[PDB]
Amino acid sequence: HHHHHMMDFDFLEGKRLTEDVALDETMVWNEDIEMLDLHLVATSALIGVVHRVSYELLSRYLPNDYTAVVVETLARHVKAVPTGTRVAVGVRVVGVVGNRVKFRGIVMSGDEKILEAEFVRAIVPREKLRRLALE
Amino acid sequence: HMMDFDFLEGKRLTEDVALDETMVWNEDIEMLDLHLVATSALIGVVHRVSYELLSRYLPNDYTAVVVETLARHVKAVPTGTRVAVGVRVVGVVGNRVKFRGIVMSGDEKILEAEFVRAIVPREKLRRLALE
C-alpha cells in the first residue's frame, strides 16, 4: 500500500542550471607526491562538483517525497586545472526514461573546457531508498 | 619519450579500503542520517588504487592521470564500512591504459567502473599546467 509511486518525470526534460563553483583544497589530486605543488584538481572531485549542480537543479522540481541519486556517470577530463580557482559548471537534462534522468555536464575554466560529463540520476522515494540502505 | 606499456596488460591490484566521513553523500538534508557514500568519492577510491598499481611499474620520471572514467553505482553503502576494491588493466593503446574496477561490500557489488589513465612525463604536465 506504500506502492503508490507512478509518475512521468518527463516534465524535467530541458531544464538547465549553471553555477560558479570554487575548486578548494579538499579537491586536490594527491596521488603523486612529486605533483603536489601544482595542486591540480582531481577528476573525481570535478565529477562530484558536476553531480552536485544536478541535485541543485532537480531539488526545485522533485515531488516532496522523492530524492535523486546518481546511478551512472561518464566523464572526460581533457585539461588540467589548479585548485583555488572558480569554474563555471553547467548541467542540462537531455532525457528521461522511467525514473532515470540523464544529464550532460560541462566544467569551463574561463573559456577552456576542463571536463565534460554525461550522467544519470534515479528518482526514488526517500522511504524506498532508506529501506534499501538499511536492509 | 617512446615506450611500450603493453606489459601492463593483465596487471591487478585489490585493496581493503575504509569509507570515511569525508566521502559522505550530503546533497539531501533528509538523508544525512544514513551517511551513504557518494558516487564521486567511490570513483576517487577506485582511481587511487589504479595509481598505486601503475606507480609500481612506471619509470621514475613518469606519472599517470585520469582522462576518462565510466561508472555504475548499483547499491547504496554507508560510510564507516570497509570495502574490497579491485582494479585490472584490460587494455593498452599507446600511453592509454584502460582499467576495470570493482567495489564490493562483502558479496555485494556496490560499484563497477571502467576508466583510462594517460601515462605522461611529469615535466610535460608541469609544462602544460604552468603555461
Ligand SMILES: CC(C)(COP(=O)(O)OP(=O)(O)OC[C@H]1O[C@@H](n2cnc3c(N)ncnc32)[C@H](O)[C@H]1OP(=O)(O)O)[C@@H](O)C(=O)NCCC(=O)NCCSC(=O)CC(=O)O
Ligand atoms: C593527460 C593530458 C595532458 C593528455 O593530453 P593529450 O592527449 O593531448 O596528449 P597525450 O596524452 O597524447 O601525450 C602527452 C604526453 O604523453 C607522453 N607520451 C605519449 N605517448 C607516449 C608513449 N608511447 N611513450 C612514452 N610517453 C608518451 C608524451 O611525453 C607527451 O606528449 P608530447 O611528447 O606530445 O608532449 C590531458 O588529457 C590532461 O591534462 N588531462 C587532465 C588530466 C587530469 O588533470 N586529471 C586529474 C589527475 S588524476 C586524478 O585526479 C585521480 C582522481 O580522480 O581522484
Ligand SMILES: CC(C)(COP(=O)(O)OP(=O)(O)OC[C@H]1O[C@@H](n2cnc3c(N)ncnc32)[C@H](O)[C@H]1OP(=O)(O)O)[C@@H](O)C(=O)NCCC(=O)NCCSC(=O)CC(=O)O
Ligand atoms: C538507486 C537504486 C536504489 C536504484 O535501484 P533499482 O533500479 O533497484 O530501483 P528503481 O530505480 O527501478 O526503483 C526504485 C524505486 O523507484 C520508484 N520509481 C521507479 N519508477 C518510478 C516512476 N515511474 N514513478 C515514480 N516512482 C518510481 C519506485 O517507488 C521504487 O521501487 P519499487 O516500486 O521497485 O519498490 C540503486 O541503484 C542504488 O542505491 N544505487 C546507489 C545510488 C547511490 O547510492 N548514489 C550515491 C548518492 S548520489 C551522489 O553521491 C552524488 C556524488 O557523486 O557526489
